[PDB]
DNA sequence: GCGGTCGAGTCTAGAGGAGCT
DNA sequence: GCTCCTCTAGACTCGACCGC
């Protein structure tokens, strides 16, 4: 048969695939290791449990070059990284004449040979270059000038906008309005410079790859967040001499030293305008040349060191493949932006109207001095300034009578007009209204006067009082010595109406000294109440200044920060604030994405000849400015795209990922790894304990747990102590990353404020103590972290020089234990990219890498090759899992993690094909007003049937 | 207290309690508005007219008859117009036969005019005139506010504000979406609770796409406005013959325009706005200042009454000349306490209350009370009109 | 011909067969174009203001177009019959001669009826409005609506005021209303002598007055006044009397009813005839188009932004403006002036290169036919002043 | 001669980033 | 574990024109 098992009864890979990947023969498991694993599982009650076997999979994999799987990947990476490493070595060995004396001014690229002789060229016509792009921010996103160096001669380029004296150009950009350019393009933060290249926006892929000196610096001598903070503050500390920030000046000082670079105080591109840039063209070109030469020196001093710390070519090939991200967009992106902005403005107006209504209704408490009994508006200024001073039906009137009555009424009205002199020349500002209401209303003399309390806003200290916000049934209160907070009634020691607080809390408790929190704070001395501060993220010492901050949205969604009385417009304002938080915090980034629309001529023949194609539509591409190694863990960082945000039914603009739509004739093929980091930790523990999958309790639970049934790690952790899944997921991921007991205690206190510090400490200790489920996995992480040169256990990538124990002694261990897992994940991504590119090139599959968000991989594959692409994704996943097992000493692979659960084939980048992505900005849905049918999610069995079990067409 | 009772007492609704039920109000078979309700509906219609015609390019007024030519449609329920004289003649002049009476009844369904159910047909008949007015250019539109009759037996009357938008099919969808968004914004502009105005897409029996606005009444949602994306079939049916006269210039080409039908219900809209105003505390109707039937209320106390009434009459004449609705509460013979008068003005959605006391004859100061804040501000008479005009202008824009 | 000139300018609509005097006076077809509709709306607004806003104890009334309907034979108003009933009669049980007779009788006996006058509409709201005014007589009810009269059904838009008064003061109020209506009709006419009044007597001997406009074919009644007494109020309210008694000082009395009804369609036709090189000198408060915006000599974008702003300016102020700059056809200046004269445009605005240079816009007055320069900032104030002046 | 609003000055909390323009 | 920055916003404070 095709079924293989394990001494722990875990289904292993099928014979057909096992003989192709791991070969034949194998090795008999050791009796002692199996006995120890059985005893360990029996002690935790994880032995003998039933497990339904999965259907066997048989497939003819492509010829694996070399002996083992490792040699196959090495050959693939060396073949992929040969033409770029050749150009890199040519740059290293290149000799370059000094900078030209006077730069040219004509449009297009200019070649500067010996003695600074100018010569125009359409394109550099060179294999390798070092790039640096300057763009006039005021004018737009179009690049202004660019200076590049070549082993042959210097080059420079200036846009037509800078040279030509033409008037303002069109807003929409075109590939013809970009810098023209196998090829290698090097630079510092080259992701930015990549977006200004003409050939980088074509749907068809050109053989161009980018090496970012910032990513290599982070891979060689990167700095953590705490390390970055310490380095910035200063400029045990022996690591500061070997590390630097991502700035080009700091990198140049660290790697080459010498005269440090000085940033130009003129800042013509950042702050100035086109005229200033034109005036100081020579100085700007000199600064750009200085930056280019510094980048060249940094690359020369980094490339041999990077190749020595990362000898496996798979890492380099993956870093080259992470920098070619291509997000296709269409005319729907502009719609999305306009709808989101309009919805945000409408909801802001509605919230402002609700606040004004609350303020207007609050004034009625003045009558009878009822404001003294209001729990919120008792302490405000309710003074009022006095004003200042310096029969039977008669018949119808006749014409003369009505005329004389009208004229005498007019004259009597006009007589009182002479009393203007008796009025003060400086009129009072709403004396009848109370004191606090006068501030919220503009004066009648103001040219921008609006009716009612038009100056009221969320950020003021009266909005929480007007909304009657309560924290766990306690009205909010602002103390100047302690910021915000809340009052807890029941104490027995204008006067605050503590009886009103007691009545409100009784109502809240019945309808839904006895409280723990930030502290009673008896210094405030509010009669009949105590003053507990609102829990701030920074700590108890800090004081909150606004209960509407972004750190209170989870606290108000839980039903703790609720709007009390005035429920008509009260909770509506809070709901609106919750709805528009994402757009408020990220509208600047989303609306500033550099969108370039391709002409119909540049589009491939497949797109134009498709039934779904529209002649009036515009298809563009957004190139993410992803730093391929933005952290010490070498994971790509991008605030806008590389995030965990997903479309929500109560968030404005949350469907931005759904707007990345494949062009006609192409489809987006994607796949998400199921618990990548958890599986990596589990397999590390298994290889450390007994050399077989499932020997550790953590690995056995990972392989056998299922979210649906309720055996997964997150669900069990949530059920152990009663927390939400997402909170339990955060807890478990932090624990795997290496978070101590203090992190667990603070997370427990933050998620549930009712937990005291002692109870949180006890619960954290119980959870960490579980001789435990993950002990061997951790012992392995500590061993790897504490080694002389901590290297990845798969590709052998060395850790940052700023984290080596030779320069940090016994410090920075929590960083290294997380670095091990995250760098293993990054190596997994690299292997995935290398294998996918090899499969695409070998079997002639038309597609390109789209994006890699977290643990997801997206490919813009032609539609006709969508199933072939899915089969390729399954094969690459199998190969990567087998390589990971092989590098750890395990020549086998469990069947449960061998293949993807679902390889998505969709027209957009939604998280799941079944989701419709309804949001206050797009309430109808993606299919309703855009034309996006639901995609297809296929398992390996479904893919095999539709591909005949082969990759050839 | 129920809102309907408050409206009836303050003359926003009219009728017996049998006519104040939800079904009676929704049917429209009876006059359901008092003078304050009539003024509120007039203000709403004026706002709609301004927004949809005055501030919009190439939208023109059209007038249509209440009667339409008779039709032999299979299931038309529109009521027929029959001359009683002809019936009396037939029945008491020559004593016809049973077949003659059958034929006469058949003729009542073949030549008798029918009351219009929608304003769409009226605008289509004036399509050629508006084409000539705009030199056959596109896109133009026709707007009309009128009474449409709907079967309920009884006949129900509802006031409809209809915009018929002619545009080429290439821009039909974008125009439909823009009109839907504009109508939603217009309905939510005067709403104290804009979240109660909804929108949903609907399809007819013939498969045409369109939207339909809703308002969340306490009993449930009701369709207050409907949008339909009608093809060229309506124009072809209304003009059976040469197509040259139907084609409109879409720039450099002649295209038969695609008809968009935007139909609102201003009676149900006024009911919705009266429900939105009441909170559902001081009983107060928080109607928008652009919709409040009465904006200024005058009063007189602690005489001499002759001089105070003369001054109040002068102020009333000054306010009326500027387009401000004023309620002359000083002329009322029966006097009530200021508390009851303030409650009455608040329940009548009166924006401001002006009290002219005997001290006004000396310095010209008057007591101004606002509905929103219930606060009294001492203001000089010469500055009242300018303040009211500025307040109304700011509340409009 | 005035009729052709109004038809070509969108004041009058309809086929040439519907442009006859009988067709125009019958009201069987929509006789007004968009400019005619705007002029009629302006006239209705003037009537409403002068009779309600500037009047004491006059209130709005909204009434149905259908009446409960009754057997009374003299009635000639068209009836309302459900077609479904007739279809059921003719395509089902197939009744006989007697049953058809009974069905026809039931149509006249119990069915709806189209209104012929707005008098009955206000009488149904008499109690509610009496309670509104605390039963203080006198008070009136005004309404502008369409009434149906047999000629085919003719539609006429009638502005009617029902003035409730004690019996003793009926004649004085009737004479006051007559003189007020005559002054209002003569106010907007360049030839007030064409409007006239003549006493008339009803069939039941009730005294009244009528207002006539001297059309080129003869005199037509544009407004009619009656002294109806308490007959109509008692007819509409049988039974108890204490519920229809107003207050006349200390004593209570059933108020007399005065019917002030005018035809605003015939009034619009009369004013169009009075307004008549072909020039229509409509009253400034009645003119549908007051401001005409024009460009000249280029450039296009800047001048259109100029004229565009001058237009939002005059629309926010409340002044109707004809956007003559957006026209693709580049007609001659004299042709534009003649067309604006025909369309009764109050003032024409010309925007040229000098406007971009200095800011002056040439203003042409229809009445004097003279061209004058004026700054942009002073155009709105001048227009508002001119409109205020005319209105008084 | 003196106090009433008004205009900066400052102090502080939140927010975005720790790159390239 | 937990620095820095530049920034916007809000509110308290105090000197100061100016009108009574
Ligand atoms: N609390 C978490 C959760 C996830 N991740 C990271 C690791 C994953 O590779 C990636 C995607 O994880 P998801 O949360 O999307 O999915 P999980 O892997 O957690 O699986 P599940 O959601 O079923 O628990 O994000 C993390 O750092 N911390
Ligand atoms: Ca750069
Ligand atoms: Ca996943």
Residue numbers in the entry:
A (entry chain A): 50 to 230, 246 to 299, 326 to 480, 508 to 610, 626 to 644, 709 to 966, 1029 to 1211
B (entry chain B): 41 to 192, 203 to 330, 342 to 458
C (entry chain C): 42 to 192, 204 to 328, 343 to 458
Paper quotes:
DNA polymerase γ (POLγ), the sole polymerase for mitochondrial DNA (mtDNA) replication, functions as a heterotrimer with one catalytic POLγA subunit and two POLγB accessory subunits. The POLG gene encodes the 140 kDa POLγA subunit, which possesses polymerase, exonuclease, and lyase activities, while POLG2 encodes the 55 kDa POLγB subunit, which enhances DNA binding and processivity. With over 300 known variants, POLG mutations are the leading cause of mitochondrial disease linked to a single nuclear gene4. Cryogenic electron microscopy highlighted structural differences between human and mouse POLγ, particularly in the POLγB subunit, which may explain the higher activity of mouse POLγ and the reduced severity of mutations in mice.
Following the approach used in previous structural studies of hPOLγWT-DNA complexes, we introduced a single mismatch in the DNA substrate to induce POLγ to shift from replication to proofreading mode, capturing three conformations: the replication (R) conformer, the error-editing (E) conformer, and an intermediate (I) conformer. As expected, mPolγWT-DNA complex adopted all three different conformations, with reconstructions refined to resolutions of 2.7–3.0 Å. However, from this region, a ~10° rotation distinguishes mouse and human POLγB, leading to a more pronounced shift (8–10 Å) in areas distant from the AID contact surface. This shift is primarily observed in the distal POLγB monomer and the peripheral regions of the proximal monomer, with a greater displacement occurring in the human enzyme. In mice, the POLγB subunits and the AID subdomain are nearly identical in the R and E conformers, indicating that these regions rotate as a rigid body relative to the rest of the POLγA subunit during the transition.
